[PDB]
Amino acid sequence: IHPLPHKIIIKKRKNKFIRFQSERFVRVKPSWRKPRGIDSPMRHQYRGQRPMVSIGYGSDKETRFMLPCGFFKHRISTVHELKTLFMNNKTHAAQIAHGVSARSRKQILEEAKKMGVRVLNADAKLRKEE
Amino acid sequence: AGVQCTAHSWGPGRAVARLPRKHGGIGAYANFARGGHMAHPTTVIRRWCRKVNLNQRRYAVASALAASANAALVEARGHRIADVPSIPLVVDTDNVTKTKDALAIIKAVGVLRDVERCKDSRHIRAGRGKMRNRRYITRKGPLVIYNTEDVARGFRNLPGVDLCHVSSIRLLELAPGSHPGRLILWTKSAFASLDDVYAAKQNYTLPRSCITQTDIERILQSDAVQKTFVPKRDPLVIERKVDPFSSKEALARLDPSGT
Amino acid sequence: MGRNVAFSNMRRYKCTNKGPNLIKNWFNQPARKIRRRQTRLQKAKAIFPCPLQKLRPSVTRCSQKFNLTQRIGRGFTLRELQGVGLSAG
Amino acid sequence: PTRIRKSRKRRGHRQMGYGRVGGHRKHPSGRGKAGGLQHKRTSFDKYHPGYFGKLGMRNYHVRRNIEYNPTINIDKIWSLIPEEQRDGFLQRKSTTEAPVVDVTRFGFFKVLGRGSLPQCPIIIKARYFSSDAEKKLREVGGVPLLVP
Amino acid sequence: GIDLKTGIKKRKVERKEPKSPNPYIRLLHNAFKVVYENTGEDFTKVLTKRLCLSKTNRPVLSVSRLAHLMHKREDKIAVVASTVTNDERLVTIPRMTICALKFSATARSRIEKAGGRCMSFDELLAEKPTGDNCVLLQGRRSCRAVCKKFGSPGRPNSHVKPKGEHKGRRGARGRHSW
């Protein structure tokens, strides 16, 4: 339930890079699109404009993909699939998939408890006693 | 499709768009229009069949058969080979006309775990595949190549098992999924006639064998190659800038006398 | 776009959307072989001892390009027939 | 095929690689190889010399088989001899029993002399021969011969 | 911030790897590149790069070219990074050791019948990796028909030939025609 010590995770931008003019219109969805217009204030990056997605914003390769608990995520759907986490994956942690039913989640969690593998969603679908 | 309507453009000056419109002004004959033709309609004149030269279509079968001889490739293709006594496996099997008897040979030769992994695999596929006569997907497993035997009647119903005559081996069966390594159960007659089939491939010489990756590591590790190896010159020590003036020791690396 | 391009000797498609139908698709190829085999098999059954093919002569392939090769020709001359003493009937 | 194509990577780019100032329009330069002597003269002269004009006597029906004359070379006569046969012929020399190669049978009509025959008498039977063929054939000791 | 365009002629791309799906070629390139890195010999550097070249760059050397090229040095092993094709025009082939990526069936038989050896790049790596008593030989790269038609036929100093039949007299009958 405890990971390797690891180096402080630093995120260059907390916010999510909304597309330009996505607030003004519901039709423009907030998913980022490169600004590609002849007179686009966003592509000219004039003062006051939203920020632009670039590789400079990339996180440290060593701490990238790591979750706040200092663990990396492997999405498990079965007890055989707990063999990736079994092969000395002291760095990774297990997420059970959304499809997996509570019947199967109980079996997966017991195998994880024996292995010592940490399960991120260990309260999922645990509604009283079925 | 989309062109049985009679639509002509209303034109500029009616405050409408310029696309073809029918009698009431309903948009028509355009990819954007509802009921319009596709912009570039699919055609039956597409080339569906690609061309392969006999020599390469005979290299593919041979290389796939070579993968079958390789247990490591056969395990990677998803087959259960733990109990199979040898790979490649050759089993004497006089005509088997009964599925029960065929299964009894499969149980003895240790291919049964693979035949079961196919039976249990039967499921309903996701998508419109279900609607379009492709409802059930079963994992593919043993392949029974036969000659001078009626083993087909016996193994046909077994789930996941495909049967082919030596004379006409199929690459798609040999490499299901474009992955080499189908488990092949060879009947004594078929495996002992394999060299005859290739000999009767007329002017065909089997592709000459090449080296493997394991054999080139050994060859590289051989003393002759190692003797030629010369030790590389020692690398530069990059270090990092420091202010030499502040530290007596830092100046000493550059100015021993001054400090 | 240009540079050195050999020019095309292809002819422009005619009657593409209206006309006689100048496109022959060959999806009927696998099934034409089957139909033709069956017709031969049924004709063969109709005359079991008789061969499907009549004896036809050995004739020189026409032209100087194939002078020294022989091919099968439509039929025996009446002089060839008199060498074996057989009437045309 | 379609997935690994350039036009799939031009989505979101508007013009699709054809330019804002002049876009893809239908037939901007014309249809076909039209303009050869006018608007495209520079191309039809830079890369197509001889495109315009008439250059020779015209045969209304060329007879493709009277015209066909296949050729051999004094260098490839001995590759026509089967390999097992060729070695014995080479060592023996045998002016008495030298291998007659009827090139007509192998599909060739005229014997040219591109390279060099081995030094063994041969005898080559053909419809026609070059000058430096007969010179090379007769130096080796072989006799040029004509076959019906 | 930094003018780095005044005297720099720009990066030049080269084949640092073999684009071949063929496993054996990738396995040999890696094998000889490892030798070159450990032992910095020109023969292994030229071989490393020759393996990465494309099929058009690597032309066939015939058994009549190799015979002529190795006439003075029959002892030296003739290393070809393409295919040896037989020349039936050369009735008698001389005996030599040859190491090529491929050898045609006729060319494997002819050399073996002569008493020569058809070695392979793996046999070379095992026997003479650095290249002792070996010569790297190449086929004619301009032998390609496409190479012959590159240029501007119709220009006065082209000496090229037009792509296609043409069949007309303008520009073709002389420097003054047209």
Next chain:
Amino acid sequence: MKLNSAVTASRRKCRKAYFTANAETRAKMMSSRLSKELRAEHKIKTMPIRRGDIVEIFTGGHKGTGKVVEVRRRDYKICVEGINQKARNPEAKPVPYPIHPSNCIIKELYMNGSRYRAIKRRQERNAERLARI
């Protein structure tokens, strides 16, 4: 697999057959396993359901025994006697819960005279099959 290419394995074509079948085909399609006592007696595994048949439903809701009183061919469902939907008020007509014929096993049959002949016709064809078809 099926070697008679004349038959259809298309989901659409097969479903159309079920949904839009002639009555004579609908009746055979609506058939039920005979009890093991009747299987020994008549030597036939399944008979098409009639009106006067005592049947045991081994289904989930409405499992029970009853005599069929209505055969609804268009819905492909039969109504035994006894098995009915819960009634909102005691003073109301009982509504039979429609049960599939495949969900039930026959315990008694209406022998008639045609049913006796039909059991005989099938018995003869089954005997020929048992004699190595």
Next chain:
RNA sequence: GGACGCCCUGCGGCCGCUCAAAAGACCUGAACCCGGCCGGCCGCCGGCCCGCCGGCCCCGUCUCGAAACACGGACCGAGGAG
């Protein structure tokens, strides 16, 4: 395909009933838009407890050059072009 009780002049309300569920004239039920309650004071970006300070013209488009008093675009969903 809506038990029964209640209140209706009645329309119809209500309580609940049948059902696994109303799924109640119909599967799921989005966006636009709207009404009740319920906070808040108002767009984007950045800082901070978060309402103040600082930056911030309307995009697409041809165009030497568009916030343009150039053009198209009320809004939203689906379809829509190498």
Next chain:
RNA sequence: GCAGAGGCCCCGGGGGCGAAGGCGGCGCGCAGGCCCCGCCGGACCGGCCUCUGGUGCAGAUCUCGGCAGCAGUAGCCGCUAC
């Protein structure tokens, strides 16, 4: 990222012990996007390799469907009259 095909998913992938989808909220990714969680929903769904495309929208006086402000607005002023 999408939709299909041929495979794989170590006792034979995940599913009424709840599929797809819808709605909110975390996490992860430079981002395209992905994952999970609660809720609604009520039968299907994929990850990976190889394969195929009628494969991704803000615009086109775009098509078709819905629908807003305007707006309880302009109007309901021929034929004498109740």
